[PDB]
């Protein structure tokens, strides 16, 4: 079930890139806590912040809309 969660796409991208959550916060332009809530999948990033996320996380919004995190396993 699921078609990947934005939050786990972030949690995954971020570790793959090796970015500290506070640094990601600074890159995107949010408080570290907002990152935390996003990955913990309480809040969801909206258009602008989603773009800023995608940029900070070295990808297109497409990546997170779809899940371009690998190339197998529910097209992770």
UniProtKB/Swiss-Prot annotation:
Annotated region of DNA binding: 21-40
Keyword Secreted recorded: no
Site (Not N-formylated): residue numbering on this chain: 1
UniProt keywords, alphabetically: DNA-binding, Repressor, Transcription, Transcription regulation
Domain HTH cro/C1-type: 10-64
Modification after translation: In the mature form of the repressor protein the initiator methionine is deformylated.
An MF annotation (GO) of this entry: DNA binding
The keyword DNA-binding belongs to this UniProt entry's keyword annotation: yes
Job of this protein: This protein allows the phage to reside inactively in the chromosome of its host bacterium. This lysogenic state is maintained by binding of regulatory protein C2 to the OR and OL operators, preventing transcription of proteins necessary for lytic development.
Name of the protein this chain belongs to: Repressor protein C2
Species annotation: Salmonella phage P22
Gene expressing this chain: C2
């Amino acid at each position: 079930m699921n078609t990947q969660l934005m939050g786990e796409r972030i949690r995954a991208r971020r570790k793959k890139l090796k970015i500290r959550q506070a640094a990601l916060g600074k890159m995107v332009g949010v408080s570290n806590v907002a990152i935390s809530q996003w990955e913990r999948s309480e809040t969801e990033p909206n258009g602008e912040n989603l773009l800023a996320l995608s940029k900070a996380l070295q990808c297109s919004p497409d990546y997170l809309l779809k899940g371009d995190l690998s190339q197998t396993n529910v097209a992770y």
